[PDB]
Every structure is written in structure tokens, then in C-alpha cells.
Symmetry: D4
Amino acid sequence: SFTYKRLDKNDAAVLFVDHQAGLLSLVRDFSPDEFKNNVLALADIARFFNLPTILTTSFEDGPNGPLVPELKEMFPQAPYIARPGNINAWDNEDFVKAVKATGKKQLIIAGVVTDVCVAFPTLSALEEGFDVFVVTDASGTFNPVVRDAAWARMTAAGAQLMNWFSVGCELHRDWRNDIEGFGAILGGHLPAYANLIQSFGT
Amino acid sequence: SFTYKRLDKNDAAVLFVDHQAGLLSLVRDFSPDEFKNNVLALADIARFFNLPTILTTSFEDGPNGPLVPELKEMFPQAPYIARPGNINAWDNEDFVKAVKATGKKQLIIAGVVTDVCVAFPTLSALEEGFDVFVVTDASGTFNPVVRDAAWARMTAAGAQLMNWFSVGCELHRDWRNDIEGFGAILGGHLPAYANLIQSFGT
Amino acid sequence: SFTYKRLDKNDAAVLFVDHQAGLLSLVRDFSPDEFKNNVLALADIARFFNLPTILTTSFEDGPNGPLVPELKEMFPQAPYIARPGNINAWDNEDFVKAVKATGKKQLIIAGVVTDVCVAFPTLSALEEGFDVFVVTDASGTFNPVVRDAAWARMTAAGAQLMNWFSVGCELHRDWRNDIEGFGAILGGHLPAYANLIQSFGT
Amino acid sequence: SFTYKRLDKNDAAVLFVDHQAGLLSLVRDFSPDEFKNNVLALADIARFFNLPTILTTSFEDGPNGPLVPELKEMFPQAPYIARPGNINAWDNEDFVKAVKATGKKQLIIAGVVTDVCVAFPTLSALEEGFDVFVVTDASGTFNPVVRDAAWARMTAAGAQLMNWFSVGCELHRDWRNDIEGFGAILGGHLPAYANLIQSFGT
Amino acid sequence: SFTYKRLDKNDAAVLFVDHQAGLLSLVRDFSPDEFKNNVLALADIARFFNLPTILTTSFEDGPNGPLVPELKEMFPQAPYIARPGNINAWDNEDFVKAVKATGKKQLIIAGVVTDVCVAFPTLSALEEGFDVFVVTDASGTFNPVVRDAAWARMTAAGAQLMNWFSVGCELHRDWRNDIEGFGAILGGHLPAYANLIQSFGT
Amino acid sequence: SFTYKRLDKNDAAVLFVDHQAGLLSLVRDFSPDEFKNNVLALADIARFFNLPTILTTSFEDGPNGPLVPELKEMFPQAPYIARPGNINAWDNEDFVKAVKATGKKQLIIAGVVTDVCVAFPTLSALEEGFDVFVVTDASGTFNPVVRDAAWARMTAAGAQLMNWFSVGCELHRDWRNDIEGFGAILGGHLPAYANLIQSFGT
Amino acid sequence: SFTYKRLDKNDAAVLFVDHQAGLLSLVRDFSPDEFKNNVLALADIARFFNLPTILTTSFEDGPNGPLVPELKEMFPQAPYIARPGNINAWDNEDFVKAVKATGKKQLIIAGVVTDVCVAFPTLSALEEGFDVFVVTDASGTFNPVVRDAAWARMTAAGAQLMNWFSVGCELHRDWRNDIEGFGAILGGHLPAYANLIQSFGT
Amino acid sequence: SFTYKRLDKNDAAVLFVDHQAGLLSLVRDFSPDEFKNNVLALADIARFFNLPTILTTSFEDGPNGPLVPELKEMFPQAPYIARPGNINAWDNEDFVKAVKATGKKQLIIAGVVTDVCVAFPTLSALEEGFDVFVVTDASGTFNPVVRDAAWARMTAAGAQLMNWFSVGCELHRDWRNDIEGFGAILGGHLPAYANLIQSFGT
Ligand SMILES: [Cl-]
Ligand SMILES: [Cl-]
Ligand SMILES: [Cl-]
Ligand SMILES: [Cl-]
Ligand SMILES: [Cl-]
Ligand SMILES: [Cl-]
Ligand SMILES: [Cl-]
Ligand SMILES: [Cl-]
């Protein structure tokens, strides 16, 4: 009567949509420090579980600016779709081609801005039957109101709202799978947890 | 399961409901500066995509006051329905006649106050089978609490909660349709984006 | 698909649940000034439309305290069900008997605290087929978090979330029905609107 | 047609998931003072109605830390499942065995963090047909945003969002069942209510 | 050496500066409900101690609007200085004449907006050696930031920042001077205190 | 140019002013849970350092209510001055004599409400040459705005604004004076610190 | 003792410091809409009173970006000091030369960021005996905390904290000097005031 | 009258007081992410300008925990004073000896918690004639209220309130001294500025 459709590290792909230097300037519903940390945390997680990753940008040869250096340094062979025109990434045939090429049913998505560059392909992907998991604290927009409206629209469509930590834990399932490696991610992106690790080590 | 019913510039109409000088005094869930900019942004979008526009007021010959000058000056040829009595604009026969005369299926709506002058005709239009897109940051009310209640009541009815930027982007689809013209709108109503444009130009 | 079940002044009853002198001390999700004004506003509306009203209190001979004086004075002929024990007012046979005696299908409810004394009979009434309209700004509780949880639980059951102003406007329908009388209510409970009325009068 | 599935003191069990000294350091969406009180309030309620209670921890021999002393001391006969690995408590067979051994259909659940250690077994329990009641103010996580996303994910699955006070009142049903005893709980965890009791006593 | 220059009911006068219907719409650093109550609370206090009162307006024959009806009705023989031009009330000779005619050394001042219509005559009066007491919660302005700046400029000049309740209490000194009369003021403007009074009476 | 006048456990007395069951209902600038904890923390500290303590109430045979039980239970033999009339405790001769009987130079003060029952005797005590230390988080009032006004008036007078934790640390000076005894206070009133102690203990 | 040193339109100069496209991205203590409006409001005022204006930029040929076009287009004959190196504008000899060349004693200053590009020359100018008026709502920085610290450092030095509206009123003194002209500024930068003007005009 | 005593890179020393893993858990007036970045930003600055640096801890062999790893790794030759007992670092003779041995007049100070471990030695140092510069965003405490109280006490003693960015810029004076080197610090600790640098590089 209910199915817990949870993230599986063998059934998931990660979509980084338009984390560009210019567009990040528009993000005001998260502080710059927390937002940078959250996006990098999701990125470390995508790497850690060796999930197929897709990078895409919107009009990067204009004021929107280049993709943040970390994402390129980190996934140097991930499909990189520079969209010259299409705002909705799902309207770009090369992007959709890359998504389906992964053969993944679950789509983990984060980007800028939430109400547009994330919501639009989320709604399109849901229409095509994909399970979409939105990393909400790795997605930014103009203000808390715009964010809440975007959440309402995406939940109404059946998207699952999460955060980089809950995404990581649902993928990881069991601490004993890799204690040092997974713990390094938590320590590196949760200063409060890093402190616990240091106190515990004495 | 889910169908992404997105804005089409050939199937949509814009409704400005009761942006009056007096009633705007009641809006406290947005700062006066951000709200004026948001209402003006939606207006530029309505002009830019050649959408049929409808203006309506409630009891403008009383304390509710005249329609704001920007809306009258920008749409001097749009149908203007001054409602002497009916609080729900949909209870006014002239208003519904003008809406149906546009022949549009999608209704983009914004106004004051959100819980009444927007919510009531939204619910009425949804009952008559229209697809309603609520511009949440161009609609104001007494406080965030009343707003959240109005949102809940509208989403329960199947309204799509959006914002002027996401409305504009879903209408535009592709940057290459009109780069300068659309960029002018974003630049004129997103100071953060205007700064990006200026830096890019040197 | 969707049906706009809106308040009708001939099909509605008002339930004031446990606005007691002691319990009001627990309301911290509204300022005392705004909350007192909102409850009195709802009372004026019920009186203005001559709606059948029911008053009920919970353990008033204890720390919960007496019903606030304004409610007793404005509705001296309303059914007054003092519940010595039952926390859910719907578990009281005298209260339910009084509700059905009104013969009303729509129930307008407000009270303290929101998550219990309002939510419980709201959920019970919805189960018995009543259309329930919750006046959210005339219902108080411990904090915004508790309030949001109550909203989530009540909307999930099909309650309609509103506020005293939208309640008033949906009942009144047309300004011309009684301009001075209804305007008196707005003037008396919306200081910003009283200011408009005074400026307009010069 | 809505059915009001309310808590029954003979059909409910309480699950305390990972209220550990280390993990509590991660909770920032509640103040430490209010969060401690809220968890202890839930504990007093579980003791008061003699509800079968289950305690569980996650990797307590690490930085996550030991279970807080109060829960251990207040439920000395409760099943205590120390999970060495599984992040989702429902993936632990000893935990699930203990839950089903109570023979209770309704699960009252609280823990840290909300988006993971509460949400994951909540979704799992719902999948196995349990009615789940989430004590939201006795569950903590990193920030209000992550909390809201967890709420969205849990309501979409049919979990009921509540708080310790509403849990207590729905369990208690009638004040006359135990005036002194139930009032002691409210007095002990609602400082405002303790004050009412003291004034009333003079 | 510090001297506690406290309010004396025989050496104080009250100045209401520009509480006009139009200007009040500019006040956003207080909710409309709490601000109306606070200004009326201050007015009740001025009445209770028979303090010499001065009313003044700024360009009331324009958009600024008339003085609120409550103030004219409550001090009908108090000096009423309608300033056609001077923004700083102290630049108006009739106003200064009326102040000095009271022969009072202590000046209690409140008005709209705080940073201008209150701050300017406050700074001027301080220059002339008057002891100035600013009722901060009966003075409004555009936003909290502007208010804090206004406070900073006034404390730097030696103004004493207070609120209507502390003003009332410093004037009253002893409860036994008039228990019923003074308690009536607190009950009428402190809903929480009204609740205490009602519970105490049973 | 500056002297660090810090608390000396042989030169200080603690004044609890009007922590009464009724008046506490007026406190809205702190949550009930954090405020109760802070007042009790200050109280444990006064006992721990064996400081002469004075309890005083304002009109306790009325709606103001009795002194909170914890204070009487902990300081049953402390001077208790029940003021029937004087709002400023310093205008009560019995209170002042009880203060001077201590022979202490430093006065540590906390109470309700901050802008009156704390501020007034604070300003009076400063006038008589006492060094006054205000425990800001153990003093409550109507809202943060009124609080900020009271702080401004007190610092201008030379009061030192502190909190219960800094009061204790300045009194204690050295951890090694009593590690367990002082640690019990921190553990008992700082849940985050209690958690540290528990993790450290494994 | 105290002297009310108020702005005189014949003794004041305006300093716009580093309102550059890049640096504006760092301003998060104001929304972009309100901040853009405030800076332009200050600009309109300087133009309106024909105050000598100085524009200066910091390393504009780098990431800091060009001066915003509005400032350039409204003060085409103002001194433009592009500082390649000096962070403190007062460390630039050309800038100081231009300031003294105006022969103005009162300095009205605004810029980005507040704690550095405004604070540093503010403190330097105060050291040289200038009276400095800081337009707080036309100066931006990283967050409210940094802002408050900057205010603290500047007030301690004797700077007068103001906002663009109070600056305008203190320069203007009298409404009758230019009703149309001055009202145009208020209407153009205070939307609520524009609404009053429109309502008044019918 | 006023002297601008600004930081000189040849007359300043940096004091890191008690940034310990356990104690950092008490910091709730900053998010963990921004606070870690701020503390690390100050450390990069201390190193960049080759400032004499002093590290000190409080009871690090208890629940307070070890000094955070970043500080020890960065400054292996800095004086490290582990205080077993004294809460005020200035009461430790080794600490005072280490400070005076630097021969610096200006003290840049940061630590945990603000109201005690920073405030106490700040007040002591001010008493001995040092110029103290408090890095407010690299100092944390329990909540914003306690923070504001600590600021008041420090400013009253003549402390200068600052932030790491303003500290860096006042030390740096001129961009051209080291463009690349200083830009690395800003890029590394101001995500928004890193974005500007990347956009500029294209
Ligand atoms: Cl494309
Ligand atoms: Cl009509
Ligand atoms: Cl009953
Ligand atoms: Cl396990
Ligand atoms: Cl005049
Ligand atoms: Cl007395
Ligand atoms: Cl230069
Ligand atoms: Cl020591």
C-alpha cells in the first residue's frame, strides 16, 4: 500500500545543473559559505559512490559564467553539456541522451536556480517516469519564498525532497561498508561532526 | 502518472487583480521595494511575450484606491473591468467574459490581497477547468502566515505556485529566441544580474 | 475534478473552542496584540452575519481558566458547552448535539491550542462529512513549528485553511450588500484600512 | 472519505532513535534547552501511559556517542538495540523484531537526525503497514530547511506530523482519567502552564 | 557620578508628533496592531496623569493625511500645531512656544517616523537642555535597520530610550496610588495581563 | 582610562526581583524553556558561591501572582521583601536596608520585567554608587525591542550587561577550585555541555 | 554640552565609495531591490540639492568591477578617483584633494563594503575634524553582524548614523521650499508614499 | 579629539583563545559552516602578514576538548599555553608573559565563548593599556542575545569591534603590495568573490 522508493547506489545518477560563477551570485536563500559546502558535499558523495554524473551549463559564454572549477576538476570525464539556448535542460537533446545513456532510474538533481534550472528538468523527468530526488540544500534561488513555491510545485509532481546528508546516508546504508572513507566526507562537510571525531580520538 | 503542464506563450493570458494604491497599504509580507519590482517585472513579461492581459479593480471609488499608474500606462488597450461590488472577480460577468474572450487555457494571476482577491478567482477558475499559475512574489497579503494558508488552499485545488522569473523562463524556453530583449528584462528587475551583465561587458 | 466549496452565510456555523484566560498564556506563535484582535475580528464577523455560534471550554474550573469576557458578552444566547473532561470537543455528546442542531454543513473553527483543541474536533468533523474551514490566525499554539505540523495534519484530512479576513470576504461576497456595516469591521480590525478610510474622507 | 486514525494508548508503542550525546550536537533547528525538554516530555508521556518503548542507537562506540542518560534511566526494561552499522534502524533485524514483539500497530517515533534516523525507518515502517506518528518537536536536524524537506517526504508517505503535547492529549482523551498525574506532566514541561497552576493554587 | 533622572508626573509633558493616517502606512518596523495599541497606550497614560500634551502634524493637507481620530478625540483642548512646512517640529515657533508654556523640563516624545519627525526635535530639545524620553514602541519607521540607526543617534545625544509601559510605571511609582485606575490601563493594553486579571477574579 | 571591575565572590550579592507566576506570562523575548533554565542557573550559582541573596515581589496578592516555587525552595531563609506598593524596589526602605545589611558592593540583578522591575532599581543603585551587574538572559520583558531600549538606558548609566554563564565564570575564576561542583551547574543547565561530559566519560 | 550638528545643504558633500558591479555581489545584509533603490535615492538627493559629489572606485580593472552606470550617468562632472591600490580612500591623495577642494565640512558617505570601504575613510575623516554622516541603508556588507560591528566602531568615533530619507529631510528642512520636486523623490523611492500621492490625487 | 588607531602589521599580535572541539559545540550564534570559515580566514591572515600568534586552550584535558587541528598544523612554532585552571587567560602568567614578549601594542583576539573566554582577557588587556581589536565573526557564543551583551561590555571598555575581512584590509592597506597572495585569501574564504575572480578570468 506504500513503497519506500529509496536511493540505490546501483540505480542512481547525479545531475549538476548550472552551478555557474555568475548564477551563484543570485543565490540568497542560503549563505555563500553553507551553499558552497553543500554543493561540494554532494559532489564528494557522487564521487564516493562512483555514480554516473552529468554536468550541464546554461549560456556559459555570457554573464552566466563558467561552471565552478571544482565540478570540472572532479568529474573531468563526465558528460558536459553546454546549452547555448535551452533553459530547461530536458529540452536539449544531448542532455537527455546522456541521462538515458546512464540507464539509471533514479535521478539525483541539484542546481541554480531552484525554481527554474532545477524545477523544469525535474518536472520533465518526472513526466518521463524517472524517480527524481531533489537535493534541496545544494539547490539555491533568490529568496526563501521562491524556494517554497518551487518545493510546492515539485512535490505536487511527486519529486522526493532531500538534502546532501540524507542522500549520502540512503546511498551508504551501512556504516561498516567504509567507515574511514564515508566518515571523511562527514568530517569534511560537517564541522560539528569533525569536532566529534577530534574529541573522540583523544 | 504526472504531466508537466508548462506555460506556452500562445496558450496563456495574464490577470492583474486589484493592484490598487490603497490595498497595497495592506501588503506586509513583502517589502514595498521588492513588491513593486516584482509586479513591474511580471508586467514587462506580459508585454514581451505579447500575452493578452486583463486588468481588474475592486471598489476603486473608495478607500481601496485607483489602479497603480504603471499598469494603466503599460496596458492602455487591455480590458479594464472595474468591479463595484463582487469581491471574487469571477462573480463579475464582465470579467469572466473578458477572460474567455482571450480564448486562453492557461491563466497567469497576481494581485492583492493573496488570500482573497487572488485565491477566490483562482479557485473559481480551477473549478471551470482552467490551468492556473499563481505569481506568488507578485501577490501580497497581510503577513507570511496568511500567505502560507492561501498557498495551502490553492495548491490543494491544483494551482501551480510560481514566481515572475520562473514564469518568464518557462515562457521564453530558449535564450536564442531574443537574447538582448529578454536579457533586458532580467537586467532591469534583477540588480544582481544587471551587475553580471556590466562586469561581462568590460 | 475540483469543486470550489466556498463559505455560504446560510450554510455555516462558527465554533469558538477554548479561548480561555489561562490557555491563552500558551500562545506564543502570535503576538498577544495581533491574536486578541484576530479573535475579536472573527467574533464581529460571526455576529455581523448572524451565524449560529457555539462556545466551548475545557476544564474552566482549573488553571485553564474562564472563557474570555468578550466572547460571553457577544454571544449570550450561544450554546455554551463546558467540557469538564473531554479534550477532543467532539467526544462530548452535548457539543456534537449542539453542532448538528444548527443544521449547518460548513463549520468555521478557531481556538487554543491549534494542534489539539482545534485539530482534534476538526479531524473528527471531517470524518463525519462536514466541510471544515480553519481560521488559522484566530487559532494559536506554542510555536510556529507546532503550528505547521497541525496545518500539515489538517490539510491532509481536507480542512480548508483560511484567515478571519478571507472568511469575512467569502461570506460577504459583495461590497454593496452592506458597505458601512462591513467596512466598520475592516476599519475596527485593520489599522492600515482604518487609515485609508480616514484619508479618503478628507 | 477521511478516517480519523487517532492514537490509542492500548495500540501504540514509542521508538526513541539515536538520541545520542554526540549526534545531539548536530541539532540546530531547536535550541538545546527546548529540545531537551521536548524529548523528556515525550519520555514522561510514554511512562505515564505505560507504552511499550524501544531504544536504539547508531554506532555508539564512535563519535555518535552514548544514549543520553535520561532515556536509559527512564526505560530500564525497554529493549535496547545498539546498531553497529545500519543507518536505517529498520534494516536491523533485532530492531524490527522488537517492534513487532510489542504487537502495536501505531508507532510514535522521535530521534536524531530528522531527515535520516527518523525519516528512513518511518518510511520503512509505513511500507510494512504501520501507522506512524512523528513527534516533530522531539526530533532534531541541522537546520529548518532540512527539517521541512524531511516533513515533506514523510507526509507524502502518509506519516502523521505531531508534537509531544498533541500526542499526550490524544492518548489521554479525558482530563478526569488522571487530573493530578497528567497535570504534573504539563506542569513539568510547560513552564507557562506550571505558572498557571501556581497562581490558581493561591 | 551618575544621576537617575526619572520621570516625575509633575514635571513632564507629552509630545505626539505626526501620527497621521498617511504617514502610518510607512511604518513597517511594527505590526499595525501592536503599534496602534502602543500609541493608544501612551495616550491613555498621558490622560491618566493629567499631563500637559502637545499634538503636532506635518503637511496634513497633503498625502501625509489627518491626525488619527483617537488622538484628536482624547486631547481636544491640547495645543494642536499644524506645521505646513517645517519638517523638524522644533523649527516651528508655535510648537516651541507651546512646549515652553507648559513649563515642563521632562519631555516624553513619540511619533512617525522615528528617524526624522521624532529624532530631529529630540536632538534639538536636547541641545536646549531638556530631558527627553523617547517612547520607542510608540514611534515607528520604515524598517528595524533605520530604527536602530535612529536610536544610535539619539542615545549619543543623551536621550533616554523607553517604552510606554516603563513610562507609565516610572510616573506611577506606587501601585496603591490608584489600583483600579492604573490596572485598567494595563488590562486594556496588555492582553496577557487582562488574562491574569480575569483568572484572578474567579 | 579603564578599570576591569569584575565580580568577586566575597563582594557580591544577588537580587531576584519579581520572578512571579503571573508576571512571567508577560515575558515573550525569551522562550519559556530557556528562560526558566536561565533563572534557575543563576539561582544555582548564587547558592554555589554562598552569595547573600534577596528575594522581592511586587503586589503578589494580586494578578502578579506568587514568587516561583523554585526560588523559595532554594532560598527559604533569604530576606523576602513583599512590596505591596512600590514599583521600583529601591523606593522600598525594607528592601534597601536588606541590601545594605549584606555589606556588599557588587549587585547581581535579574527579574521581570526588564524595562521596569529590573531597570528602575538598577538605575537607583547606580546612583548610590553600587557596581551593578545585570543578568540579561535571566531578565525578561515583552519583546526584543523593549529589551534593547532597557539595555541602552542601563549601559548609559554604567551598568554591566552580562549573562548567567559569564557571571559564574567571573565568580569562579579557576576551574580547579571545584571541578565537579561547578561542572554540575554547567552540566545541569547547558545540555550541549552535558553531552560533552557524557561523551568524555566513555 | 551637546550640539545638534545637522546637515546643511550649503556645507555638505556626498561621497560614493566603490558601488561597483563586482563588490555589490558581496552585499547580503540588504536585498538587491532595496539596496539599489536606496543608493539611487541618495543619488537623487545629491542631484536635487546640487551637492558636490565625489565618485571613487577600488581596483575597478579587476574582479571588483566597474562603477554602476547610474552613478556615472547622474554625476558626469563629479571627480572620479579610480584607486588602483589604496583600500582606504583617504590613503589616496587625489581623493583627499578632491574632498577638500569642495571646501565642504560635512561629509555624507555611502558605499561597499560598510566595514571597510566606508568605515576606513569615515574614521580617517573624523580624525581630520570632519563631521561625517553615514547613510546606513545605502551602505552594504556581508551580513547584519558585520554591519552592527561597523556601526559600533563608527559611532564610538563620533560618526552620525543616518539613512537616505532622514538625510533628505535634514537637508530640505521645509516642505514649501520645493513641494513638487522633493515629493517626486519620495514618490520615486518610497512606493508606499507613491501610493498615498496617487490616492490623494483622486 | 578622535584618533584613528588602525591596525599596523608591525604593531599587532593575534590571540586565538580556546577554539576547542568540545567548546565549539556551544557556538549557536553562527552556523558551523560560516564559523569554521571565519576562524580559518583569520588564521590565513595572521600567517600572510607574518603576525606573532599565540594559541591558548582552557582545560583541554577535559570535555572542552583539544585545540582544532588547523590551528596547530598552521602555527607549530607559536606559543601554546594550555591553561589547566584559569578561565580568564590574562590570569595565566605564562599567557601574559607570551603576549608581552611579542612587544605588540595592538591585540587581535578571537575565541569561544565570546562572553567569557574572549571578553575577560579583552577587558584585562584594556585595563593594562593595550589596543584590543575583537574579531566578532571569529568569536562565537550561546546565542545572539549573549553576544550583544558581550559587545556592550567590551565597547564600553574601549574595545574595537571588527571582522576578519576588515582586519585583513586594515592590515593590508594597499592592494598592490601583493595582489595574487591577498586575492587568494579573499577567494578562499569569500565564495562570492571566488566567483568574481573566475568570471573575470574568462
Ligand atoms: Cl541548448
Ligand atoms: Cl462587480
Ligand atoms: Cl467533557
Ligand atoms: Cl546494524
Ligand atoms: Cl511649519
Ligand atoms: Cl512597597
Ligand atoms: Cl590608490
Ligand atoms: Cl591556568
